[model samples]
Target: NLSVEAEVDLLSYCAREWKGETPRNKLMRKAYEELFWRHHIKCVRQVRRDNYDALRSVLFQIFSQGISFPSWMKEKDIVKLPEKLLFSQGCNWIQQYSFGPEKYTGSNVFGKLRKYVELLKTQWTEFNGIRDYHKRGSMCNTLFSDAILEYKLYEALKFIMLYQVTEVYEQMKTKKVIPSLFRLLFSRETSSDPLSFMMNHLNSVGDTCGLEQIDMFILGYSLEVKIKVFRLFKFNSRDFEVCYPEEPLRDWPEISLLTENDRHYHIPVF
Candidate 1:
């Protein structure tokens, strides 16, 4: 039977020996392993009884002892430890709570960001097509102004900024279409460009929210475009700036390349 004195001694020993570098004392490592195993066994029994508080305390002690969960512990139980701890500890456990369990896969973040970009791309294409239709006298002069697309485009940029993809930046940089899209949006030839206007608005919002220039860089990096210049419009200082990219490319893909058959492959809509 485990005594309170024995547990305290084990914890004190672990705290002392876990600090040294390599050539770790074998006795110290052994003590940690034994303590962790004991706690794991206790947690297993507590789990059966749905004793979440007891399980949380046991798991917390094991973690505080500088021992990670053993591989033999069931994944379900390991995941539950954080949830149980959060319930007892309140919001303080937020940073400690493991976000990458079964619920949050890389596919979850990447898939969502991918779908969002694809949807924006599709919508932009349609919006531009309508503008072209009006310009060509194919429809009554119902010009697709920046006002109509403001909210949607701004929200897309906001989402892109929020979900900055560090890993995919390199791969996305190789995509030829991104530079072209950047140029099409920011080129001075268009007197009233929606993309330029939207970006300016977004920058102002970012500033208001205390976001930095790095946030914009992350967005551009994720899209594989180099931001050459970002300056707010002089007339509308309240709005975000129109950004220009270096050496802009054109000839954007006319169709949604992300579509599978007639249906566009999209992430789960929130």
Candidate 2:
């Protein structure tokens, strides 16, 4: 079992190890491989547990009608607007769509989103700066490095999914950018590790744009794993404990409506 303390320590060590590197410097890559091999089995379980816990909290608000739009936006006004316009308004719009525009508001959805981004950025900044590796054992250092990369990638995927839905709207011309970005994200030429590829994609996309690109990436990636992104909005602790995990919202017809026809759209897989 992975404790919260252990996960935090692993992240701290990873931030310390990832300072500076070059293509010629195979050291970091070798270290990552060794760390991954050593803990891959255990880490996957740990990650799934972490994801389940986090998803549970997030999904609780989503499923219970606890999350809702700001008091300002009327249903008539929201429905009349274009998809791109809605997303452009900010995180409130994103949260509104996730839980439906009609629900009552009280949850701190945007605050959670901000914290998620801050946590990742903090780890990323730490990774790029520190110089010592003697505190944590060599094995510990490598594992932390591997774990942080995975953690960052997962959070980034989640953030992009929520904020970039409008970018994936069928009516937009920029929707075409999705395939190109996916190719860049998953291309073997870019990086061998999916986490590393995701980090590079984040850097390339910058902050203001490229939602369509990330949205498609999630859609394609979720299909590969047989997970519906919307189902992530529901919570059930019991399922996390079972051998055959139950998807909480599997029977919820609303989830299908949320992501209708998403899988039918084709994008290159690599």
Candidate 3:
């Protein structure tokens, strides 16, 4: 019924922060698999639909024990767990949930933030205020006065999610690569000018959203990545296709994005 919600729910469980040094990247991959499988199994067994508290306690248990299977669960329950989550997908899970204009969640807006942080309600306020601010302050430079802060915050989170890797993140931040990142964003709107991009972005963020398919080309050529955009408005799984690949290089980088039904885009995190 709430399969897509469950999928995103499971992702949050696995989307934990990582901190370490000198270990291969496979180390975190294994950690995510373990975290996800553990939460998936427990959630399938104990979670009741629409019951956030019930699911939250389960989150705590898995964190404390970090175990995948419950001893009391029958062997068949294991089979049921995976199928229950993956098959229950739905686009109906997409609903309105506002975070803030600019890092709101100011206690007055608890119910609003609760939407996206549904099962993780306990983490919502804290996540918004401090946990996010400490990390967001340094990495985020763009002042998103008008853009959807929800999506903007996610952009901050996108880095926090990946930049945990000490070695690779530094290389990605090098002068040669970092400047193009600006180009990829600036190429659109603002007449591909820096100051123009700055004015529209800085002017209290007042702006109308429009067809953004051009970024598919921008990310494709400007950033030199193959862009396949996945539209998430309906229940169809194959409702996506690659925009274009300039060089079509075998060794080139590739990125996947999921465009919201409304008019927003997102980088899908597996």
Best by TM-score: 2
The candidate, 1 or 2, that scores higher on TM-score is: 2
Residue 32 local lDDT, model 2: 35
Candidate 2 lands at a TM-score of: 0.29
Q: Tens-digit lDDT track for model 1 on 89-173?
A: 3343223211211122232433333444455555434443442332332211121122223223333445443232211332345
The predicted structure with the larger lDDT, 1 or 2, is: 2
Query: In candidate 3, what are the lDDT values of residues 108-195, reduced to their tens digit?
Result: 3223322332322222233335444424322222222222333433322211211112212244545335434444554467524433
Clashing pairs for model 3 are 3-88, 145-205, 146-205
User: Model 1: clashing residue pairs?
Assistant: 200-240, 200-241, 201-240
Tens digits of lDDT, candidate 2, 1-270: 221123323323334544457642344334333334543411211222332223222222122222232222332232223233434655454443221111225565454445555554444344434344332223233423454443433344354443333333322334455434434433445432333433334323322223232443443333221222321112121221111112343332211111111222111011
Best by lDDT, which number?
2
Candidate 3: deviation at residue 142, Å? 23
Model 3 lDDT-worst window of ten = 91-100
Per-model TM-score on C-alpha atoms: 0.25, 0.29, 0.27
What is the lDDT ranking, best to worst?
2, 3, 1
**Over the full model, what C-alpha lDDT does candidate 1 score relative to the true structure?**
0.30
lDDT assessment of candidate 2: 0.32
Q: Which one wins by lDDT: 2 or 3? A: 2
Q: Which has the better lDDT: candidate 1, or candidate 3? A: 3
